Design a protein around this ligand. Structure first.
Ligand SMILES: [K+]
Ligand SMILES: [K+]
Ligand SMILES: [K+]
Ligand SMILES: [Mg+2]
Ligand SMILES: [Mg+2]
Ligand SMILES: [Mg+2]
Ligand SMILES: [Mg+2]
Ligand SMILES: [Mg+2]
Ligand SMILES: [Mg+2]
Ligand SMILES: [Mg+2]
Length: 257
RNA sequence: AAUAUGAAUUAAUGCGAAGUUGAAAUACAGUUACCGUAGGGGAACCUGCGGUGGGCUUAUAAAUAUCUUAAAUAUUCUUACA
């Protein structure tokens, strides 16, 4: 059985929500309700099978290449992504419930701001945030996820997913919406991706992708509607990126010590 | 008539030494042995008929074998997680 993880300072979260982003009702929808909804569906889908003993991140990797397990993949991807989003927007990862700590001033580290300049042609963090808000509004028509990811070449770049798209495995990033029209450049990217997946010799037709997320923003209606409303998702993404917990985001960047 | 004794006369058998004529039995003993019975032969034995195993249970291949996430996941784990 997959159970909803306990969050630090949960009593505060159920009373005052997440300050500057979500209210108490908004956080109950995104985490206490939706995370319960996802975990229960995952348990029903995976109970009695070998996947029941694996964590959601491992389930999505195991099932990423199986077309008829997409339902399990979607549930595992959503569960992992939601706790990636709830973790970097959380007031404090440490449990100051008995310490009553009200001073958590987290700021981008030097390694993060050095990789931002290197990967974005000298752009500042503030400018990159504006590009992230723009990318979300023009690339994610409906539900999806906004990620700041790091690849095998030490370069930070921006990835957007439609519905439950994993950042780890490029064949399942779901960054192109094929319901609408696509340019020849987008079709080239899809055609090149298909060729890479066909070069793999494995009988499971799986490739190696070492991309890892650094920041996760939930773009689903379960996270913003109640507090911002239809059409105000760009005001929601702005608040999230301005109130990130950088103790978690800094720890996601590999240092090598 | 019985019992006992001796008895002309006559039958069976044991042991002892010790050669002779064969080689019947014990191994598939060189023809499986033996049981009952009959006939035959210097001698053991041979032959016929049925029976027995205390002789053959001593018994030992015409072969062909299959698909799900090989791993950022199993393989590690030291009373921890829950
Ligand atoms: K004889
Ligand atoms: K006889
Ligand atoms: K006879
Ligand atoms: Mg003779
Ligand atoms: Mg003889
Ligand atoms: Mg004989
Ligand atoms: Mg004769
Ligand atoms: Mg006979
Ligand atoms: Mg004999
Ligand atoms: Mg015998």
């Amino acid at each position: 059985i997959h159970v909803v993880p306990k969050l630090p300072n949960s009593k505060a979260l159920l009373q005052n929500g997440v300050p500057n982003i979500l209210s108490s009702s908004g956080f109950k929808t995104v985490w206490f309700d939706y995370q319960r909804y996802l975990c229960d569906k995952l348990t029903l889908a995976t109970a009695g099978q070998s996947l029941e003993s694996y964590y959601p991140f491992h389930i999505l990797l195991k099932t990423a290449g199986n077309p008829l397990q997409s339902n399990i993949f979607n549930l595992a991807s959503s569960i992992h992504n939601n706790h990636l989003f709830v973790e970097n927007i959380l007031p404090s990862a440490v449990e100051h419930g008995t310490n009553s700590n009200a001073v958590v001033k987290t700021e981008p580290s030097r390694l993060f701001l050095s990789k931002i300049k290197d990967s974005f042609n000298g752009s500042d963090w503030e400018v990159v945030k504006e590009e992230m808000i723009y990318r979300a509004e023009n690339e994610v028509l409906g539900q999806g996820w906004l990620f700041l990811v790091e690849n095998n070449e030490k370069k930070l770049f921006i990835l957007t997913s439609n519905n439950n798209g994993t950042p780890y495995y490029f064949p399942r990033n779901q960054s192109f919406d094929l319901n609408s029209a696509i340019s020849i450049d987008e079709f080239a990217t899809l055609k090149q991706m298909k060729e890479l997946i066909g070069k793999s010799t494995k009988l499971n037709g799986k490739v190696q992708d070492w991309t890892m997320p650094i920041i996760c923003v939930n773009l689903w209606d379960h996270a913003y509607l109640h507090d911002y409303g239809v059409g105000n998702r760009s005001k929601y993404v702005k608040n999230v990126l301005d109130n990130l917990n950088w103790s978690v985001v800094n720890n996601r960047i590999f240092s090598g010590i």
